[PDB]
Amino acid sequence: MQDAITAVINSADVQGKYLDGAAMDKLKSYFASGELRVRAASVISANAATIVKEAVAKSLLYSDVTRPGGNMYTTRRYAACIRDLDYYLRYATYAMLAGDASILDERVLNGLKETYNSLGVPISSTVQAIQAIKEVTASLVGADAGKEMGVYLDYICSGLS
Amino acid sequence: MQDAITAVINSADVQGKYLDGAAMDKLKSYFASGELRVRAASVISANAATIVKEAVAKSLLYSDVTRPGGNMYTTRRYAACIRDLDYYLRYATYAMLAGDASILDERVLNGLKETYNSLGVPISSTVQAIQAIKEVTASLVGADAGKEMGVYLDYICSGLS
Amino acid sequence: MQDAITAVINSADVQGKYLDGAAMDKLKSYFASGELRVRAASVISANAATIVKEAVAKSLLYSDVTRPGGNMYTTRRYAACIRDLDYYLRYATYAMLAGDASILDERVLNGLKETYNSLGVPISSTVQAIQAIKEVTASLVGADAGKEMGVYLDYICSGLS
Amino acid sequence: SVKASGGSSLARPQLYQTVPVSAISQAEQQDRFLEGSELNELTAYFQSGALRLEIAETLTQNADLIVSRAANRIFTGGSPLSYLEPIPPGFRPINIARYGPSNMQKSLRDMSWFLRYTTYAIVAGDPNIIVVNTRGLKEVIENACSIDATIVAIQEMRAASADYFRNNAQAKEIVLQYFDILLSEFKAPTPANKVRQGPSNDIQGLELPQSYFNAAAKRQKYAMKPGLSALEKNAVIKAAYRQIFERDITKAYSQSISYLESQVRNGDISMKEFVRRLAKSPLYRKQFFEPFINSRALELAFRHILGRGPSSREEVQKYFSIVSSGGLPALVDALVDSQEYADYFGEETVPYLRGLGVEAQECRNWGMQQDLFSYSAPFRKVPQFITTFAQYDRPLPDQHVYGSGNDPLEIQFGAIFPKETRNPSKRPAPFNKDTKRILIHRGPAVNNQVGNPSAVGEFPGSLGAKVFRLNGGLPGAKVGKNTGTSVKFGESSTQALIRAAYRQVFGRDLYEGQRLSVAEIQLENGDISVREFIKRLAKSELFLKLYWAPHYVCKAIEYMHRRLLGRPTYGRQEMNQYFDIASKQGFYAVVEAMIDSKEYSDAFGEDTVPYERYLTPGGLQMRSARVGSLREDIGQRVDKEVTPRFV
Amino acid sequence: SIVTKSIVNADAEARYLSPGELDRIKAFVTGGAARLRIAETLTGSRETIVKQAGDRLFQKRPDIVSPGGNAYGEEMTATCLRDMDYYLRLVTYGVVSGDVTPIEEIGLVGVREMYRSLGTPIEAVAQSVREMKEVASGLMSSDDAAEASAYFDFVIGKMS
Amino acid sequence: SIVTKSIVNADAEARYLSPGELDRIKAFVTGGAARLRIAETLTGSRETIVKQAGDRLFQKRPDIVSPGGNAYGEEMTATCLRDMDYYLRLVTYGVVSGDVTPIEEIGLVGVREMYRSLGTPIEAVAQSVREMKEVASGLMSSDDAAEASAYFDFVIGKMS
Amino acid sequence: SIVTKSIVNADAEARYLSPGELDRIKAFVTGGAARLRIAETLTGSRETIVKQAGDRLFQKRPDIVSPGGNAYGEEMTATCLRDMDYYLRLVTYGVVSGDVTPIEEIGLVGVREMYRSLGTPIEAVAQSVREMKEVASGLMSSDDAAEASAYFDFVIGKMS
Amino acid sequence: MRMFRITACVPSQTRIRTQRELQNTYFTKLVPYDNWFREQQRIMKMGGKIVKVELATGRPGTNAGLA
């Protein structure tokens, strides 16, 4: 994975030049937003199971999926769906703390669309479930850090499609 | 596609020998049931729109699926679901006439799950709608031929799992 | 695709509700900005090649990208990148006129990451070129409408990165 | 038929071991150049090989005489050679007529084939070809052939080959010992079969005969014993690094944990404990956990620790639940502290890759494990196991008949296909001939030709793509506007049609020196119709260069069908048709066939420019499952937001 | 929407919007307050129009309400009034958009196949909207009614 | 970065970052202005360090530039000065990142194998970084020098 | 502690502590006196923090003290404030240590298995510590409360 | 991290059927505390006999500071 610090180092490393003032401003922006990122991560970590709880209730519950014939009928499937949204929330916080969507394109999305197609998991529904996470996360933490969380949750939605 | 005849032909052809006594017995068993197969097909042919009508009224109508927010709300989507159940009844008749569920694997369930997941077609509600066809067809045709029709209608249902 | 009018209508249609005070105010806000959007689009239309000219000059030209070894070396690949940014600016104008980024997801960003990876097109170099478009467009059009264009150009960047 | 395929990569079983094969593979598995030992194996063999040629040359020529003298001694009552294709224990000479012709034909050819395999044994220089093919032969031949008669037949041939050759004691002893091995292996009854017991309920039990694991090159097994000299101790540790990291990383990058190396060299922690600590180390974590998805890192962890791929769907489901609970350490702990690991490797033995030859294989995860045992496995980042296992129970997926790679991305321009080599994501599925793919219509759902074939030439009314037609009169059609009329209004409409006709054949608008000006003006004059104009743009050398030539043949056919008809192919029936034309006639006739097709004529007239009519479900998902464009009522429960009753 | 139509046309030609197309939106944007006036009038008296056009339909066509009809019963008439309430809602979306797209997309395409399946006479639904047009016309100004009639006749024309 | 280190460790155990790891990042983020200041000083006299430390290297170790040496020649001397420019660049990346991970991943893993293949003495390059340590400390304050030298001695320590 | 984990992380790679890692120990030690001040506030008012939040639990969830509940009687209520006293002691260890390591190993590992055996609702104990966080936030300064909040929320978060 | 100095023989039950090579079943090794429960259970299920177990790493009755 790459964080915002490593990303601007690697961009300078590939060119084979020292970090200039324009590249240094990218770091200073991260060191300014770093306090906002750490505080946001602490809130989501505390309400990790709680954010999912509201998100499933808003989007997934009392729909087609949970009813017999759907992809969330059996208790094993339902628990796996909670597990999947527990995955998505945990990795979105990792990417938020890093300040780069490198971990998502490495451990989350790179070979997820193929699995979801094969298992018969509806992508259109799970995207809406992550959008349900996005709304809960932004309401709990704030508008400033929820927008930051929003980008990386949208990144998962884009990779799934 | 493969019917009950061509299945016997296929098995004999790959062995590289003429149709033996056991092969002739399998054909005669199909021809004995063939009188009931054509009879059932003709009734479903004549009563095609009526079976669908009764099935939609049983399960789909006056529900959350047909109401705003549902997938069978829009008129282009309603007519799609009618046509979808027009497919299911037609191809179940096809498989009933054939004596094999090969056509269902080739045309009906050939990436049906991924089609329904992409559009956002309810998997649970469609299965119940095919079951609504199954119950109507069995009450319309008979207890023997309707049950025989019910095997292939369950095959579509189990294919959507 | 859907514009700001259609997005309000669809949201009201999904609920199954008539256009309420909140829905009417969302339309009135678009009709207030309608004069700003049309005039902005006419400026971009007139200086279509000019924006792309000063976008490549700022970011891409006189770099390792233009020089041998780089992706935008050959005249074939240069005219390809010119066309790409011509497409990016035009679709940003469409989204600016519509007041929704639905067209960008449908016609541009639909498997654009997978396309650019397979060809070997640098994401960071492309983003910078769209970032160069943003600054050129804002200097040409204005402050408010340049900000409006800047949102959808960031939306292309976010979907590509 | 099966609904999923794991792949059918080429399997190369070792039928018999030779001296060069035994020497080269010995250092290959150790990842070393052939040292003073393995060179001397070849040196002595290459010198003796010249003599070994003289052994066979005499035995191949006099092969008829040896089998004649054998059969005459064994079989009595006539001549056994009528139909040619020292220590008696207590044999009775078999009658020719009593035994029957069919049994005699078997008996004669085996006697020749025994000698034939002896000649191959000397040439190979290793009696492996004998040991394999003779060990479990006594039992199967007992039924309708006397054992007592066979032993004296080989013993006759032993004397027959001895007297005929008789050169030197350094030469004849090679003939003697290989025959001595032959009789001893034939005297030996069939050994017990290697039983691969299922580790749990989920995995099936297997069996392999004691003959298949006698030739197929035994995997070098290293065990850390505390007393060993540090050179072979280093060889054990290097092999342990070669198992966990797929390669010797301590030689490559000098990446080694000496902290763990010291404890195993002493015997503080066992090899089981070493593998445990090495697979939860940051050195493994960075390389085989960090770059991969949770499912794929699990699949890699299987081959590193257990030395096999996941066997069942339930096994992947179980071990994914572990890696979700506690992560990498918990996964490693589950893999090392399994009933399978301690049965195969125990505590001292280094894990080894158990493939085709090592043990009995199951017909479930064949191609999935074949690609996994390859060194190109940690580049396939798409999981192969959980994908195939889930697809096994499910019906046929939304896929092109010739694989997932044959499907292009549903974009405006550019034929973009998933590469087989770059990021292995090949998903084979057993598609038969009469398999129609379900396609989503761009326009109304009722206007699909699968259910409504009459509504094939119905235009999508603000649902699909814009239809371009030469409805308006072309400029200079009639001699009404005589000479002048500079402002002829019907001129911009036909030019916009041309541009759209260019945009359909080639997704993007072309450059200045790419536009076929001859074809454009003939359409504008009214010499040719749109159908002919589309055909000419697809018959262009530019279309050949840009879409046909750089792409796979069937990929190029598929993309052409998606451009000219605006529709993916339904299945095999259509794809095989155009592929047959592509073989015999060429590219130009494939263009001709797609235009002159009835379905083209029904959808688009003589004046109609083609358009995107049907999408693949995967293609529409890319369009309408993103953050935007996606509606609220696709796959989400919609609650009616009403103002509360207290308000 | 006419904005949507103009962009789609520009998308297909792969060009920036024509100065004629830009002026078409500009005229629609300025004349958007008039469209929202008609929409609010139809929204404000939605229960009045449906009830008036309902009774007027049932007098003209008694057969649909009479025993043996499609809309016979207190629950079936309620569905018929709901049907018109849906169609009137579709009109209000059309007036706002300034285009006959949203009416077509949601509640016109696959209507013939829908009402045949339910066993509803299609000409009686065409009459119901024609009665809805008549009530709506005599509740607003002449310029407001003529603009609204363009969308109403589109609902009638497609169903007939 | 310690951010990357903490996330991957949390990723390994499949758990959210502990507040004992989050406070480490918080202290790292806040104390970043000092690290960027040291890096700016190092990049400011990038040529000055290489020239001075290079001159002192060939003075102390003459056999490097003597006939039979590895850096003996025209381009060979230039490549070693370029190699010093690489390691100084690697140091600046390390100071910025506040970790020895970027130095390791780019140009420290397989250094022993690289210089063995080229035929370059490993301890002389370790001496070359040690000379770069002394020059960089000279053009900086005691607190800034000791912080940067810690990254320098890591490069020396990994080589020799 | 932060110290013990940094040693573990360094020993896993089999190397000395990083210049960055040593700075994180330095950052913890410098702010060590601040962490002790947080602990001194909590330990000094141990009686008031358990009585206030103890009552707040019973007012929020009365089913605990209701007949049929877990903590019913004079003895069972005395064990509930004893339990909260143990968790308050764990928090003070965690702030001093700088990590949630001592909280985990003593009274957080197998917390689900413990209360399941005793027949105690795990959500109720999660709410009890959540009430302790609210009382601690008011009595202590904003900077100290926000630092201690993360340690409290970890106890609640794992018990949820 | 507390470690147990364990001494146990674990005879193979399938060695005859599997036809695998002979391995030294008697081993004196250090095993982590977190793994020992799964380790001990594995040995005694195979019919293996545990000879001697010693707490070599750690202090008996420790509350804080283990790993």
Ligand SMILES: *[C@H](C)[C@H]1/C(=C/c2[nH]c(/C=C3N=C(/C=C4\NC(=O)C(CC)=C4C)C(C)=C\3CCC(=O)O)c(CCC(=O)O)c2C)NC(=O)[C@@H]1C
């Ligand atoms: C009654 C015994 C207790 C109780 C019930 C209760 N359950 C829910 C919510 C759901 N229950 C399930 C579980 C299943 N559905 C299945 O298909 C299966 C497998 C056979 C099971 C076990 C699900 C999925 C839901 C969600 C509803 C849905 O279908 O989408 C609730 C509602 C919770 C809420 O507030 O949302 C309730 C009340 N609760 C009690 O107190 C009883 C002891």
Ligand SMILES: *[C@H](C)[C@H]1/C(=C/c2[nH]c(/C=C3N=C(/C=C4\NC(=O)C(CC)=C4C)C(C)=C\3CCC(=O)O)c(CCC(=O)O)c2C)NC(=O)[C@@H]1C
């Ligand atoms: C919940 C939002 C929706 C849903 C989920 C669902 N997932 C599974 C099973 C699996 N989940 C995955 C996916 C991942 N593997 C990874 O590496 C990652 C990234 C870290 C993830 C998220 C996989 C591979 C599996 C298979 C393991 C298993 O068998 O459990 C299921 C179970 C389906 C089944 O039983 O076959 C479900 C239901 N699907 C829905 O219905 C929700 C909308």
Ligand SMILES: *[C@H](C)[C@H]1/C(=C/c2[nH]c(/C=C3N=C(/C=C4\NC(=O)C(CC)=C4C)C(C)=C\3CCC(=O)O)c(CCC(=O)O)c2C)NC(=O)[C@@H]1C
């Ligand atoms: C009705 C039982 C449920 C339902 C149906 C529904 N389907 C669609 C759209 C499509 N249906 C298909 C599927 C098929 N075409 C085939 O060739 C076959 C095999 C014989 C089938 C079954 C397709 C391809 C489409 C896409 C449009 C097209 O016709 O090409 C919709 C509309 C989805 C949309 O948003 O456009 C609907 C509503 N959904 C329900 O609510 C019922 C439970």
Ligand SMILES: *[C@H](C)[C@H]1/C(=C/c2[nH]c(/C=C3N=C(/C=C4\NC(=O)C(CC)=C4C)C(C)=C\3CCC(=O)O)c(CCC(=O)O)c2C)NC(=O)[C@@H]1C
């Ligand atoms: C001299 C004959 C005429 C002339 C030249 C001129 N060119 C540029 C700018 C560029 N030229 C190219 C073209 C190519 N690069 C390639 O790789 C190839 C294919 C082998 C060609 C032909 C490019 C890409 C540039 C951009 C610079 C760069 O490479 O980074 C200029 C500069 C104009 C500007 O500033 O935009 C000039 C002056 N101009 C004339 O009038 C001469 C007759």
Ligand SMILES: *[C@H](C)[C@H]1/C(=C/c2[nH]c(/C=C3N=C(/C=C4\NC(=O)C(CC)=C4C)C(C)=C\3CCC(=O)O)c(CCC(=O)O)c2C)NC(=O)[C@@H]1C
């Ligand atoms: C310019 C900013 C950078 C760049 C561009 C570049 N693009 C291509 C070729 C293609 N571009 C696309 C992408 C799209 N397809 C779509 O549907 C859309 C949205 C409407 C886009 C933008 C495609 C499909 C291609 C492939 C060929 C084609 O034109 O059809 C190239 C050439 C690549 C090649 O080797 O052929 C280049 C260079 N690359 C840079 O260096 C710039 C930073």
Ligand SMILES: *[C@H](C)[C@H]1/C(=C/c2[nH]c(/C=C3N=C(/C=C4\NC(=O)C(CC)=C4C)C(C)=C\3CCC(=O)O)c(CCC(=O)O)c2C)NC(=O)[C@@H]1C
């Ligand atoms: C009244 C004008 C006529 C009439 C009405 C009638 N309709 C139904 C059934 C349905 N009508 C619809 C149609 C729509 N619902 C929508 O969402 C839209 C688009 C916005 C339309 C136009 C549907 C879907 C239904 C099903 C009802 C349900 O929600 O379940 C009936 C009932 C038919 C029956 O007997 O089951 C009736 C009576 N019939 C007449 O005779 C009038 C001319």
Ligand SMILES: *[C@H](C)[C@H]1/C(=C/c2[nH]c(/C=C3N=C(/C=C4\NC(=O)C(CC)=C4C)C(C)=C\3CCC(=O)O)c(CCC(=O)O)c2C)NC(=O)[C@@H]1C
């Ligand atoms: C035969 C002379 C007598 C005999 C033998 C006997 N031994 C065992 C037990 C085992 N012996 C071994 C084998 C070895 N371990 C090594 O490392 C080596 C050197 C390479 C050898 C030879 C092992 C591993 C076992 C344990 C069982 C296993 O296969 O894993 C038994 C079996 C005892 C039991 O009941 O389990 C036997 C019978 N016993 C006699 O009566 C003979 C006089």
Ligand SMILES: *[C@H](C)[C@H]1/C(=C/c2[nH]c(/C=C3N=C(/C=C4\NC(=O)C(CC)=C4C)C(C)=C\3CCC(=O)O)c(CCC(=O)O)c2C)NC(=O)[C@@H]1C
């Ligand atoms: C409870 C009755 C008393 C008690 C128990 C206690 N045990 C441990 C530690 C372990 N217990 C075992 C033993 C077993 N392993 C087996 O195979 C079996 C037979 C099925 C058992 C019961 C093991 C292996 C452990 C280690 C734990 C692990 O996870 O590996 C402890 C913890 C000791 C410590 O100080 O950490 C305790 C408390 N002690 C009492 O106070 C009760 C009277």
